[PDB]
Design a protein around this ligand. Structure first.
Ligand SMILES: CCCCCCCC/C=C\CCCCCCCC(=O)OC[C@H](COP(=O)(O)OCC[N+](C)(C)C)OC(=O)CCCCCCC/C=C\CCCCCCCC
Ligand SMILES: CCCCCCCC/C=C\CCCCCCCC(=O)OC[C@H](COP(=O)(O)OCC[N+](C)(C)C)OC(=O)CCCCCCC/C=C\CCCCCCCC
Ligand SMILES: CCCCCCCC/C=C\CCCCCCCC(=O)OC[C@H](COP(=O)(O)OCC[N+](C)(C)C)OC(=O)CCCCCCC/C=C\CCCCCCCC
Ligand SMILES: CCCCCCCC/C=C\CCCCCCCC(=O)OC[C@H](COP(=O)(O)OCC[N+](C)(C)C)OC(=O)CCCCCCC/C=C\CCCCCCCC
Ligand SMILES: CCCCCCCC/C=C\CCCCCCCC(=O)OC[C@H](COP(=O)(O)OCC[N+](C)(C)C)OC(=O)CCCCCCC/C=C\CCCCCCCC
Ligand SMILES: CCCCCCCC/C=C\CCCCCCCC(=O)OC[C@H](COP(=O)(O)OCC[N+](C)(C)C)OC(=O)CCCCCCC/C=C\CCCCCCCC
Ligand SMILES: CC(C)CCC[C@@H](C)[C@H]1CC[C@H]2[C@@H]3CC=C4C[C@@H](OC(=O)CCC(=O)O)CC[C@]4(C)[C@H]3CC[C@]12C
Ligand SMILES: CC(C)CCC[C@@H](C)[C@H]1CC[C@H]2[C@@H]3CC=C4C[C@@H](OC(=O)CCC(=O)O)CC[C@]4(C)[C@H]3CC[C@]12C
Ligand SMILES: CC(C)CCC[C@@H](C)[C@H]1CC[C@H]2[C@@H]3CC=C4C[C@@H](OC(=O)CCC(=O)O)CC[C@]4(C)[C@H]3CC[C@]12C
Ligand SMILES: CC(C)CCC[C@@H](C)[C@H]1CC[C@H]2[C@@H]3CC=C4C[C@@H](OC(=O)CCC(=O)O)CC[C@]4(C)[C@H]3CC[C@]12C
Ligand SMILES: CC(C)CCC[C@@H](C)[C@H]1CC[C@H]2[C@@H]3CC=C4C[C@@H](OC(=O)CCC(=O)O)CC[C@]4(C)[C@H]3CC[C@]12C
Ligand SMILES: CC(C)CCC[C@@H](C)[C@H]1CC[C@H]2[C@@H]3CC=C4C[C@@H](O)CC[C@]4(C)[C@H]3CC[C@]12C
Ligand SMILES: CC(C)CCC[C@@H](C)[C@H]1CC[C@H]2[C@@H]3CC=C4C[C@@H](O)CC[C@]4(C)[C@H]3CC[C@]12C
Ligand SMILES: [Ca+2]
Ligand SMILES: [Ca+2]
Ligand SMILES: [Ca+2]
Ligand SMILES: [Ca+2]
Ligand SMILES: [Ca+2]
Ligand SMILES: [Ca+2]
Lengths: 650, 148, 620, 64
């Protein structure tokens, strides 16, 4: 259903080539053939508006195969040849001027602008739109093409012949948005400075580096979401306001008008955390943003995250001791189900709170039901809003601790039902609500730097080297559990009762896989002979082979992802501080920074960073002399050559 | 300057950064004299006027970065490398900035197995680094991959 | 042994012939003044064959004696037209030697005397083997192109060479240029041979002509693992279409890469061979995309549907083994006293029950499944692996052996239920753990479970067929040591060791610690036991079992680069296998037909890629 | 003790345990011996070669 797309694009590219050879002028245009174009164009029946497989005329083929000598012949003979965009569901809009631009150099682009060209031509088709699709996204307009091909001579040549530097796209992207999401970042910086130079202070109401796209997102916030570390350092140099330089000690003054968490406008820290593309987390190690999060965490972020780590921990103990002291009543009838299959000797009270001890629990039980609703009023309005399970593909897949705490407050309000309607199976929802309840104490272990990168590693084993193990465990313990069952099916299950029921035979074979029971042995009755063989094979490929290989998987992984977890932990401090800043009122959380009213700098908030910069006379000697006009080493050097032939031979 | 690759421009832009001590893209005659005094030698305030008006093609007295970049083509270092090495650096350099990092060499060693500790990775850079920043240039990387 | 002995007693014997001969020693060195004296005799007996059949001219050729070799040719009978008439150096003429000596004026001096450019150098030290260090070839121009002699290949063609020259293996000259170890200099000599090849008598010219097993030069570059030669041959088959700034377009001819319907292709030949450099053509530019087109489209959706039929098969085999018919014991349990607990036996023939008729469907399904496995696997081993030539398929892929053994054990327990034999649990205990552990075969269409099933078969045959030889050394010594201590003792208190079969299964479980251990604490144990079980617990639980964690841990990070290309070579082996078995109505041809779009009769696959615009500034 | 496998495990065949036990012990068979006891082998195995240059020169300062 979707792989016909890859075929149908490749159907057109061959059909384009076939129309070239079965045409006199197109084959003449694919090569130079300057003798042949003068031969053909003096005729009458020659369709110079010949539509190929996409809409191509002779000038497009002269341009795409860059025949400038064949281009001069066609412009003399056909007047409406700078016009006529292509038609097919692929390349649309694209005239001969675009193709002369994209090839990084032509004399045709000086020639076509002389022949009244068309620079508003929106090249909008299915081959100029960014997606996991077409390998390039250059833009729509001819200036957007000339920008992102590194053409410094052509962009100066376009604006002189009446261009448009501001015009957006179908996506809403301007010219300067396209320069940011190119894969050649340092040549994009030189084109960034050039395209602002020809703005010439337009009166166009926030001139061109503040204008948002259809998402609503400035060029400064597009270096941040996409992952442009090169552009983000370049765009920051307009923000800083450097105060003084006392020798080797500077004092810059950054502008937190778009970085810091503002009001209802979605700030830049709220857009990185809610985004994929792992290079976006590289922005959180940058000189205004690293110092902002650390000053929002040491001061107001950590002491509030411990006062929520202690209210919740006194909430679970209030919920635990209402399960320990739950009501039980002795067994009524008299052991009616037969012997050796019944040992329960209590049961659960219908409704009995009539003693002074139960009213103490009635205080405690009402706390954990009120607290259960509060959990479902601060997070369920995100699943009330952003979808139930079909439109809600974001927070289930993103945060693991979202699921465990909605499940906790669901199991309490199952027990609220069963206590009131007087059901029987209450030992089951309190079995979930305790293990789910105490394992959200693992959530409040991310502010402590000791325990922080350890809970990162546990969720990378569960969704990693343990479900790579649990499939080839369930293969083995469905084979052998059906093998141990059929052997002990013809035996006596009263001196060895590990296998007398196929739900039970799954349970003992799973424990012998983990060696968390001993093993079937009697030493008074001569066992079946096949058991001594099939348990001996099961002892090798469980205890000696597959479990010690699982130590080798978790031991190989843990030194490979060992600096990623310190990148993942410091990105969960940002995810915590942003969340704590939102849900808490402004009366407890002061806005970070220093205001500009009383210091006379405006309405924008500032942040001062001072840094003892550097030395290295040797570096600055090399550049100022241009200006000046008229052993562990043996261990390290061994590691270079192991990289050296490791690189040049690949 | 018609041949400059992404590497030398990413080196010259950082070289423009520490030389400029007011954050914008304009080199004044005064802030050129700030660096010159830190070299021990003294200016004469006409030598500062000499070096600015040598190449100030627009005519503003403030050296912009395109006029800084074509200036380092006049005082060029050299162009002599191999096409496989320049491709090999762009594989190593993740965030396209013309520099390899301490976390960008622990990635390359991890793909080759090699079981490196954090201490030897900082000891690799001390034999790679020339100017003394703890950050390998492109010229520092070419000097190691064929010479020593 | 015998070949290396036969060489060294013969390589020294022809040296012994030199020291005892007048002019052969005068050919060993220059010796020009004595060489004039000897030739003016009555008769020199000029042949006088040594240990390998060489003349005095071959000695002058082999020791680079240009001065003597000029002198002998005027006083020569047919020595120039003369092969070495013996064993291992056989057929090697004096033209052959001067070529391999890489720089001679004698090669002009010999071919001046109309010397034989056609001479079959078929001894035994010219055939390709591990016994022979060089496969230079069989002909002089086969020699000259391999030793990188530019001038002599220009000169052999001039004097009427033999540019095709198929051989004992059927190898063309261009075949022998791929079998060389110096891959770079082969690329220069490759194009130099096709320039003198051009056309005229078609015969599918020399980059198409196969050898005596059927193999083009392009397909031989794949099988042997030649990678630098492989990309050079690809340049002839690609076809650039249009370039649009960075975005180019290539139109690779997919002829010798894709199996048409038969007639073994390149992808079928990388899998069958086993070289490490062979599985590297699977990462070149047409082959990398071709596999990922046949696996994304017609691969995984036909390998997950096939995996779900097998798992629905293994449940209907398991559920007819859970509900198998049994009856209570009618044999009077006083049969050996207090030492048996068999209380239920196996029915003879009793299916008259509506519960049994539903089960009777389940056994007849899993028996028909046991014929069909032996009809798609055993006819393949009839032609390749009759009884013990299956040894390659033994060691190479173990899932051939397990899936045959599964369908075999079902037929063994099919016979035992028809004739009502006694022990059915002995076939079924093999028939279950073989039948469920074949679901591990279908863990290769997943990047999740892919390189984990390869690590299991590396640990078993590399690091647990190593540890289990020094385990059985230990647990047979202590098992006979624990037995003779508790031999003179009550077997109803601490009965782990009461007979020697069970003492080998107590100690086997004490080595892996899957039992607690002998400890009664109510009776005084023998004094010798507490010593020798303390020394047992140290070299089992603490020394060797934690050593195997350090060995599986060391191997897993060391060949983790290897398992990521062992997995992608199991994608191709699955892609090819389903391509052969399934019909042509399903699985359409990969690529795009080139008949409709006016180009030819071939099959084409195109690729479109961006080339990173800074590379264009390096293309200045 | 079940977290460290220094007893066996609650198993008392010839009487039937409640149904919820075998589910919640199976999850405590995994966050357990399987996950958080082999992670501690890997974590002590990671650190034992990271600080191996230090633990020697921290020993030579225990002679002084
Ligand atoms: C209102 C109701 C409760 C009233 C008071 C509760 C007291 C907690 C709040 C006040 C103190 C908060 C604080 O600021 O102190 C937090 C201390 C550790 O702070 P530190 O000084 O060591 O940080 C120094 C870090 N360095 C070494 C890098 C420099 O920890 C603590 O007491 C945290 C207290 C318990 C938090 C439970 C978290 C759940 C545990 C999970 C384990 C898995
Ligand atoms: C806003 C945050 C939440 C605030 C919640 C406040 C709500 C108040 C209630 C909280 C818990 C409700 C559950 C309590 C219900 C039962 C209490 C009870 O009935 O009395 C407590 C028990 C005695 O019960 P009994 O009837 O079995 O005695 C037999 C006496 N006869 C013989 C007369 C029959 O006393 C004992 O034994 C227990 C021994 C003492 C241990 C309990 C203290 C908790 C342990 C550690 C806390 C550390 C926290 C910081 C880290
Ligand atoms: C992380 C991945 C885990 C995958 C799941 C693995 C475990 C699947 C668990 C299934 C059942 C658990 C639910 C418990 C309730 C049903 C129990 C059950 O299972 O019913 C029991 C039946 C019959 O036993 P009985 O002794 O009570 O009757 C004796 C009758 N008299 C006395 C005449 C001989 O036995 C049978 O179902 C025999 C049929 C085999 C049942 C399981 C095989 C199907 C699923 C396999 C997983 C797919 C693997 C993919 C890789
Ligand atoms: C490609 C073609 C291959 C398939 C061929 C289909 C053949 C059709 C059937 C063949 C027979 C197979 C089974 C033969 C065994 C006898 C069946 C039987 O006798 O009845 C099945 C039992 C009923 O109970 P009962 O026999 O104990 O007594 C009766 C109840 N009473 C206590 C009231 C008396 O049912 C149970 O045990 C519960 C069953 C639990 C297992 C369910 C299946 C496992 C799930 C698989 C899903 C994953 C697939 C991957 C996608
Ligand atoms: C009559 C018998 C018919 C039997 C039908 C059973 C299903 C086979 C149908 C063909 C689909 C194969 C497939 O497409 O299956 C690739 C998997 C799952 O497909 P999907 O979820 O990615 O897309 C959803 C695609 N739709 C929407 C069509 C489901 O792709 C992946 O997970 C690969 C990524 C690795 C993680 C998977 C690990 C799971 C291991 C064992 C599972 C048992
Ligand atoms: C562990 C790897 C091999 C697997 C088993 C090794 C052989 C063990 C013997 C039998 C086990 C296999 C067959 C099982 C059933 C056969 C019965 C049998 O055979 O009866 C065991 C015999 C006699 O025992 P009993 O107490 O029942 O007689 C009564 C003596 N009364 C009255 C003094 C107590 O004992 C004996 O075979 C004495 C044999 C002594 C040493 C055998 C070692 C095998 C040789 C090389 C091993 C490879 C090492 C390479 C490194
Ligand atoms: C009845 C009395 C005792 C008051 C009970 C209130 C608190 C005990 C509860 C109710 C609201 C709870 C909070 C509701 C929301 C959250 C956010 C939640 O965040 C996540 O799960 C984010 C996970 C991710 O981002 O991946 C973690 C628990 C927490 C702090 C909860 C901590 C415990 C709180 C403060
Ligand atoms: C999904 C997570 C929890 C890990 C998956 C691993 C499976 C391979 C394990 C864990 C969950 C286990 C199952 C959980 C529940 C049960 C029911 C339970 O059967 C009984 O009712 C036993 C009777 C009794 O306890 O008295 C024990 C076996 C079985 C199938 C277990 C068999 C082994 C399973 C499938
Ligand atoms: C490379 C090789 C040597 C692997 C090493 C494995 C051996 C140390 C193990 C694996 C299989 C074990 C055998 C599995 C089955 C049996 C049958 C078992 O049963 C009996 O013969 C007693 C009969 C009864 O129990 O009534 C006695 C031990 C024995 C030989 C075991 C002895 C120890 C063996 C040979
Ligand atoms: C009786 C009815 C239900 C038929 C059920 C079909 C299955 C019992 C059989 C039919 C064809 C069999 C397949 C035929 C051939 C192969 C290739 C075989 O390949 C190997 O031997 C592994 C090594 C390799 O080829 O790479 C693995 C099993 C498999 C998929 C078989 C799995 C079991 C299948 C699906
Ligand atoms: C690697 C080793 C050196 C470190 C620690 C070893 C000890 C813990 C072991 C080695 C020898 C053992 C002793 C060897 C002999 C005996 C006799 C043993 O049984 C008897 O007393 C036999 C007679 C009787 O039961 O009355 C009781 C324990 C004891 C002291 C053992 C206790 C444990 C010992 C001291
Ligand atoms: C004796 C009976 C009862 C059980 C014995 C089990 C033995 C014979 C079987 C069952 C499990 C099997 C293994 C399961 C998994 C793998 C990994 C695979 O990549 C190659 C085959 C290999 C290595 C199998 C080899 C044979 C094996 C060890
Ligand atoms: C079935 C009932 C009785 C108990 C089962 C408990 C299971 C489902 C729960 C309880 C404890 C939970 C784990 C506790 C801790 C973590 C670490 C966190 O970073 C990711 C989630 C993860 C990995 C949880 C996954 C789900 C989990 C395993
Ligand atoms: Ca144990
Ligand atoms: Ca135990
Ligand atoms: Ca300045
Ligand atoms: Ca300037
Ligand atoms: Ca970098
Ligand atoms: Ca440097």
């Amino acid at each position: 259903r979707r792989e016909s797309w890859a075929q149908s694009r490749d159907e057109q590219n061959l059909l384009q080539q076939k129309r070239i050879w079965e045409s006199p002028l197109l084959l003449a245009a694919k090569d130079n053939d300057v003798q042949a174009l003068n031969k053909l164009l003096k005729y009458e029946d020659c369709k110079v508006h010949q539509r190929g497989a996409m809409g191509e005329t002779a000038l497009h083929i002269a341009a795409l195969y860059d025949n400038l000598e064949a281009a001069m012949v066609l412009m003399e003979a056909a007047p409406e040849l700078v016009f006529e965009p292509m038609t097919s569901e692929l390349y649309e809009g694209q005239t001969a001027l675009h193709i002369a631009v994209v090839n990084q150099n032509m004399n045709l682009v000086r020639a076509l602008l002389a022949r009244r060209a068309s620079v508003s031509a929106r090249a909008t088709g299915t081959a100029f739109r960014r997606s996991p699709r077409n390998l390039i996204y250059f833009g729509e307009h001819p200036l957007s093409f000339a920008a992102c091909v590194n053409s410094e001579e052509i962009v100066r040549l376009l604006i002189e012949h009446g261009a448009d530097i501001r015009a957006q796209d179908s996506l809403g992207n301007t010219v300067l948005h396209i320069l940011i999401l190119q894969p050649n970042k340092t040549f994009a910086c030189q084109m960034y400075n050039l395209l602002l130079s020809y703005d010439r202070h337009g009166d166009h109401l926030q001139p061109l580096d503040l204008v948002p796209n259809h998402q609503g997102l400035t060029p400064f916030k597009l270096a941040g979401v996409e992952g442009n570390t090169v552009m983000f350092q370049h765009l920051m140099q307009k923000r800083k306001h450097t105060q003084w330089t006392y020798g080797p000690l500077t004092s810059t003054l950054y502008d937190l008008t778009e970085i810091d968490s503002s009001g209802d406008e979605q700030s830049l820290l709220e857009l990185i955390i809610t985004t994929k593309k792992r290079e976006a987390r590289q922005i959180l190690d940058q000189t205004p943003v690293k110092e902002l999060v650390s000053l929002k965490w040491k001061r107001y972020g950590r002491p509030y995250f411990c006062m929520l780590g202690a209210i919740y921990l006194l909430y679970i103990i209030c919920f635990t001791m209402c399960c320990i002291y739950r009501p039980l009543k002795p067994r009524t009838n008299n052991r009616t189900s037969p012997r050796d299959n019944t040992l329960l000797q209590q049961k659960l009270l219908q409704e009995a709170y009539v003693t002074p001890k139960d009213d103490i629990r009635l205080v405690g039980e009402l706390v954990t039901v009120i607290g259960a609703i509060i959990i479902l009023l601060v997070e369920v309005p995100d699943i009330f809003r952003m979808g139930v399970t079909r439109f809600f593909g974001q927070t289930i897949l993103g945060g693991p601790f979202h699921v465990l705490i909605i499940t906790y407050a669901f199991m309490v309000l199952v027990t609220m039902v069963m206590r009131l309607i007087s059901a029987s199976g209450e030992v089951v929802p309190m079995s979930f609500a305790l293990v789910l309840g105490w394992c959200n104490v693992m959530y409040f272990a991310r502010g402590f730097q000791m325990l922080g990168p350890f809970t990162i590693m546990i969720q990378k084993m569960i969704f990693g080297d343990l479900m790579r193990f649990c499939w080839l465990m369930a293969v083995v313990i469905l084979g052998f559990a059906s093998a141990f069952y059929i052997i002990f099916q013809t035996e006596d299950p009263e001196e060895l009762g590990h296998f007398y029921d196929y739900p039970m035979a799954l349970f003992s074979t799973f424990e012998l896989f983990l060696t968390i029971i001993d093993g079937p042995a009697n030493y008074n009755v001569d066992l079946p002979f096949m058991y001594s063989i099939t348990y001996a094979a099961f002892a090798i490929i469980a205890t000696l082979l597959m479990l010690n290989l699982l130590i080798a998987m978790m031991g190989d992984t843990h030194w490979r992802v060992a600096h990623e977890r310190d990148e993942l932990w410091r990105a969960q401090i940002v995810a915590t501080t942003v969340m704590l800043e939102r849900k808490l009122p402004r009366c407890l959380w002061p806005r970070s920074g220093i205001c500009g009213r009383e210091y006379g700098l405006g309405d924008r908030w500032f942040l001062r960073v001072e840094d003892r910069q550097d030395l290295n006379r040797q570096r600055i000697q090399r550049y100022a002399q241009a200006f000046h006009t008229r052993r562990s080493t043996s261990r390290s050097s061994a590691n270079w050559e192991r990289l050296r032939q490791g690189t040049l031979r690949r | 300057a018609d041949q400059l690759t992404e590497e030398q421009i990413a080196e010259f832009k950082e070289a423009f950064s520490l030389f400029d001590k007011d954050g914008d893209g304009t080199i004044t005659t005064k802030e050129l004299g700030t660096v010159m005094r830190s070299l021990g030698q003294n200016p004469t305030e006409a030598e500062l006027q000499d070096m600015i008006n040598e190449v100030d093609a627009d005519g503003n007295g403030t050296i912009d970065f395109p006029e800084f970049l074509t200036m380092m083509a006049r005082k060029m270092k050299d162009t002599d490398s191999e096409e496989e090495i320049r491709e090999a650096f762009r594989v190593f350099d993740k965030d396209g900035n013309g520099y390899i990092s301490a976390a960008e060499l622990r990635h390359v060693m991890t793909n080759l197995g090699e079981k490196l500790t954090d201490e030897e990775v900082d000891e690799m850079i001390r034999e790679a680094d020339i100017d003394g920043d703890g950050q390998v240039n492109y010229e520092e990387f070419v000097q190691m991959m064929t010479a020593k």
